[PDB]
Enzyme design. Structure first.
Site, PDB file in Angstrom:
ATOM      1  N   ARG A  34       0.918  -1.203   0.076  1.00 53.06           N
ATOM      2  CA  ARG A  34       0.041  -0.077   0.042  1.00 53.06           C
ATOM      3  C   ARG A  34       0.941   1.291  -0.049  1.00 53.06           C
ATOM      4  NH1 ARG A  34      -2.582  -4.181   1.449  1.00 53.06           N
ATOM      5  NH2 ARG A  34      -4.838  -4.235   1.459  1.00 53.06           N
ATOM      6  N   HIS A  45      -9.630  -4.896  -8.724  1.00 49.98           N
ATOM      7  CA  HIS A  45     -10.812  -4.075  -9.542  1.00 49.98           C
ATOM      8  C   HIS A  45     -10.897  -2.513  -9.228  1.00 49.98           C
ATOM      9  CE1 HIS A  45     -11.182  -8.291  -8.525  1.00 49.98           C
ATOM     10  NE2 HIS A  45     -12.252  -8.283  -9.393  1.00 49.98           N
ATOM     11  N   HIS A 105     -20.698 -21.882 -17.733  1.00 46.20           N
ATOM     12  CA  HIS A 105     -20.504 -20.698 -18.495  1.00 46.20           C
ATOM     13  C   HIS A 105     -20.911 -20.716 -19.804  1.00 46.20           C
ATOM     14  CE1 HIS A 105     -19.245 -17.720 -15.721  1.00 46.20           C
ATOM     15  NE2 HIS A 105     -18.176 -18.419 -15.381  1.00 46.20           N
ATOM     16  N   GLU A 135     -16.698 -23.768 -15.412  1.00 45.07           N
ATOM     17  CA  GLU A 135     -16.517 -23.112 -16.655  1.00 45.07           C
ATOM     18  C   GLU A 135     -17.511 -23.775 -17.750  1.00 45.07           C
ATOM     19  OE1 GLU A 135     -14.982 -20.356 -17.207  1.00 45.07           O
ATOM     20  OE2 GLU A 135     -14.069 -20.529 -15.067  1.00 45.07           O
TER      21      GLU A 135
END
Ligand SMILES: *[C@@H]1O[C@H](CO)[C@@H](O)[C@H](O)[C@H]1NC(C)=O
Ligand SMILES: *[C@@H]1O[C@H](CO)[C@@H](O)[C@H](O)[C@H]1NC(C)=O
Ligand SMILES: *[C@@H]1O[C@H](CO)[C@@H](O)[C@H](O)[C@H]1NC(C)=O
Ligand SMILES: *[C@@H]1O[C@H](CO)[C@@H](O)[C@H](O)[C@H]1NC(C)=O
Ligand SMILES: *[C@@H]1O[C@H](CO)[C@@H](O)[C@H](O)[C@H]1NC(C)=O
EC number: 3.4.17.23
Lengths: 195, 596
Positions: free
Chosen positions: B151, B487, B360, B357
């Protein structure tokens, strides 16, 4: 005896695009039709009217062989009274069609890594086709109300679209070579008594 | 020809054009991720550049058909999503400014290196170097060193960039007629003009806060038990009433408390169900894994995998000189082409990933019949949710025994049950406050409710109050700890993981009631049940063609997100945790910090 030139229609190097479908009239020869049926080499073989079992005995004035290329999902449109972009804008069969539809998968031939754009179809048209009609026009489709001046623009699209056959396509998107056999019965010689 | 009919013709041209152009972009992307070479990097870029350019051209043309004159809704949907200006509502300069900011933050996150004291050459990156420390280490100071160094050396680089990224993204959003950039992300869930199925952008905030109130009790007892078990492990580092130190949570941000299992395990003598030894015992390979995944979906009435799937996918590491990006991903290249990229190994985790997977994929084959613009999950959480419920049913002992990997001479006892739920809770439950807290902080920054000079003051006030997590080192306003998460610095909405989690249990609860499953919800396997399969397929085939409120009603029968099945899944744990905490403190004081 003359053997009907079917080796040229089915085994041609390159088929025509479905908008510019190819017709080959067959006349004054002998067609051992049973060779095609019995050969385990076709995926679609549905006949309408006549019977494919062993009716290679009946005579016909002229036999018309129409050959093009479409993708596998559109094969269902090569039948009487069908709707779709092929059956409305490229190749239409009448309601009383008498003949046969033969189709097979040509992914090994007409597909190329990177896309084979040799084969086209018509995507827009002012109206539906009459049975057995052919439209090879390249006029810019006017979708709006402004004239297109022969050039692609807003609400002005080029009417023919390409396939782009890649060997990795799903089967519903793979090239299929079609051969449509029409059997004419005019009050006429009857020169094709295949047997 | 009306403005609607011209649009029906404009979409017709786009759909055929985009489909081939997208197939060409996706195919180049595959030849790179399976064959990392310099020529395949350029070919992935040129083909991706052409696809990006085609969209920007069509987005401009689609803006010439006014949505106000269109009534067929399935057309207005395809038009709206195409007309979304995005960054192209800003000036060329401000768009160029923003995209450069977006890259530098991405470069800083990925190339950020921290070098240990007294050796400026033994440097580590986040992945793997620092992530290895935060996941396995039990030394307080080593874990403390990574947490802060990450950080301090990398997060501070991002603080000035993020300040200018908030002003620009708000400018873009406000020019798209949204309140702020946070209101813009909430637009994913928006629904308009469907009587009885509408959903407003502010309705998401109220629904998230509302469902979070009902998660709180489970989280507090899980928090109190994790603290109590950590307190036994670090007696001089953890207060019996204070928040948990942020560097002791199993990863770099405390996003998933999974790696705490080794210290918090309730009954550390009953072993996990690891059927991996049975897979090597039976000479399984990658193909066998995916074949067994196929049979699962077939067992519930779904279509089997395409021939192109088995021929084109990459289910095994290419090894040798040919290098590949081994991250598991599902590929809907369009045009009947579906693939899976995965460097599978003969393990239980990969066996479960194969089921996640291929889910999906079944979602992609179902909505494939839809127009191009509607070939996606109902919303952002739908696609990820459908993938998770596959691993649920597949992992149960009821299913593992039915496929020959788990001994019939194994029976579930109430202790291993609690072991299981606790490890699931560490991963599923712990992230729910982390995710709501993060996204709420961002929604407040964008809305303007947090002044630049109180950015880190409010971040940690909300870590203590909401997540029950306290920073081990005091951070001023030169830091940017939220942006130390991938993100945040890579511009991705995070609320998708909150709703996804709540969705996936609603799904699994309804399918397990269709499958007529008896017992605790966590023991359920939906195999061999075509009733369950039909109930899910009625939503998969929708894609984006219908509001996510209706698509959700097709599986569960409720029009909105709901947290009860989540609690229903975990109640056996929740009852056991409350009993373990009878002589412990449940709750946390937000003023305590490890730096006195
Ligand atoms: C096509 O070529 C093959 C190979 O020579 C031949 O056996 C076959 O009879 C040909 N097709 C027709 C309809 O003659
Ligand atoms: C990947 O590309 C390289 C060229 O650098 C080549 O050696 C290799 O054969 C390719 N792999 C495949 C599977 O085509
Ligand atoms: C919307 O348009 C499509 C064709 O673009 C049509 O098939 C569909 O029925 C239309 N829906 C309504 C409600 O008009
Ligand atoms: C998209 O940008 C154009 C400017 O080119 C503008 O007319 C329109 O307001 C923008 N649309 C939205 C939804 O922001
Ligand atoms: C899928 O099922 C069809 C029958 O519907 C069968 O023809 C095909 O071979 C099957 N393929 C696989 C990989 O299961």
């Amino acid at each position: 005896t003359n053997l009907c030139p079917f080796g040229e229609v089915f085994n041609a190097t390159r088929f025509a695009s479905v908008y510019a479908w190819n017709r080959k009239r067959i006349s004054n020869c002998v067609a051992d039709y049973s060779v095609l049926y019995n050969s385990a080499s076709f995926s679609t073989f549905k006949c309408y009217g006549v019977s494919p079992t062993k009716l290679n005995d009946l005579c016909f004035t002229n036999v018309y062989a129409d050959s093009f290329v479409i993708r596998g999902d559109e094969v269902r449109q090569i039948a009487p009274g069908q709707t779709g972009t092929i059956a409305d804008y490229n190749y239409k069969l009448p309601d009383d069609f008498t003949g046969c539809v033969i189709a097979w998968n040509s992914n090994n031939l007409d597909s190329k890594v990177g896309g084979n754009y040799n084969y086209l179809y018509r995507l827009f048209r002012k109206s539906n086709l009459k049975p057995f009609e052919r439209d090879i026009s390249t006029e810019i489709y006017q979708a709006g109300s402004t004239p297109c001046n022969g050039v692609k623009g807003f609400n002005c699209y080029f009417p023919l679209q390409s396939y782009g056959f890649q060997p990795t396509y799903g089967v519903g998107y793979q090239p299929y070579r079609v051969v449509v056999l029409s059997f004419e019965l005019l009050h006429a010689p009857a020169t094709v008594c295949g047997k | 020809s009306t403005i609607e009919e011209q649009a029906k013709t404009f979409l017709d041209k786009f759909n055929h054009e985009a489909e081939d152009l997208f197939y060409q972009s996706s195919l180049a992307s595959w030849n790179y991720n399976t064959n990392i070479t310099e020529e395949n990097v350029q070919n992935m870029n040129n083909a991706g550049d052409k696809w990006s350019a085609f969209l920007k051209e069509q987005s401009t043309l689609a803006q010439m058909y006014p949505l106000q004159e269109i009534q067929n809704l399935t057309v207005k949907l395809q038009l709206q999503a195409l007309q979304q200006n995005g960054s192209s509502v800003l000036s060329e300069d401000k768009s160029k400014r923003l995209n450069t900011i977006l890259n530098t933050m991405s470069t800083i996150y990925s190339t950020g290196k921290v070098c240990n004291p007294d050796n400026p050459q033994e440097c580590l990156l986040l992945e793997p170097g620092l992530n290895e420390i935060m996941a396995n280490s039990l030394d307080y100071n080593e874990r403390l060193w990574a947490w802060e160094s990450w950080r301090s050396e990398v997060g501070k680089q991002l603080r000035p960039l993020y300040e200018e990224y908030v002003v620009l993204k708000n400018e873009m959003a406000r020019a798209n007629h949204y309140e702020d950039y946070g209101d813009y992300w909430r637009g994913d869930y928006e629904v308009n003009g469907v009587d009885g199925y509408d959903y407003s952008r502010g309705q998401l905030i109220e629904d998230v806060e509302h469902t979070f109130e009902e998660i709180k009790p489970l989280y507090e007892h899980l928090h109190a038990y994790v603290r109590a078990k950590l307190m036994n492990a670090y007696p001089s580092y953890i207060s019996p009433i204070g928040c948990l130190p942020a560097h002791l949570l199993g990863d770099m941000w405390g996003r998933f408390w999974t790696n705490l299992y080794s210290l918090t395990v309730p009954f550390g003598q009953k072993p996990n169900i690891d059927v991996t030894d049975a897979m090597v015992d039976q000479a399984w390979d990658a193909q066998r894994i995916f074949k067994e995944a196929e049979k699962f979906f077939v067992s519930v009435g779904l279509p089997n995998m395409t021939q192109g799937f088995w021929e084109n996918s990459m289910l095994t590491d290419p090894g040798n000189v040919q290098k590949a990006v081994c991250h598991p991903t599902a590929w809907d290249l369009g045009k009947g082409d579906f693939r899976i990229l995965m460097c599978t190994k003969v393990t239980m985790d990969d066996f479960l990933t194969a089921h996640h997977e291929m889910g999906h994929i079944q979602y992609d084959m179902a909505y494939a019949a839809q127009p191009f613009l509607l070939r996606n999950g109902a919303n952002e959480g739908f696609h990820e949710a459908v993938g998770e419920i596959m691993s649920l049913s597949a992992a149960t002992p009821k299913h593992l025994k039915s496929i020959g990997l788990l001994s019939p001479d194994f029976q579930e006892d109430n202790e291993t049950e609690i072991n299981f739920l606790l490890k699931q809770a560490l991963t599923i439950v712990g992230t729910l406050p982390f995710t709501y807290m993060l996204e709420k902080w961002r929604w407040m920054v964008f809305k303007g409710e947090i002044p630049k000079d109180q950015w880190m003051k409010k971040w940690w006030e909300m870590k203590r109050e909401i997540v029950g997590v306290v920073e081990p080192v005091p951070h001023d306003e030169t830091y940017c700890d939220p942006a130390s998460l991938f993100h945040v610095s890579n511009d991705y909405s995070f609320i998708r993981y909150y709703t996804r989690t709540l969705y996936q249990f609603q799904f699994q609860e309804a399918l397990c009631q269709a499958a007529k499953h008896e017992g605790p919800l966590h023991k359920c396997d939906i195999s061999n049940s075509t009733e369950a399969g039909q109930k899910l397929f009625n939503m998969l085939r929708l894609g984006k063609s219908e509001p996510w409120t209706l698509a959700l009603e097709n599986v569960v029968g409720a029009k909105n997100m709901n947290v009860r099945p989540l609690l229903n899944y975990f109640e056996p744990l929740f009852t056991w945790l409350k009993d373990q905490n009878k002589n412990s403190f449940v709750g946390w004081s937000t003023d305590w910090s490890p730096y006195a």
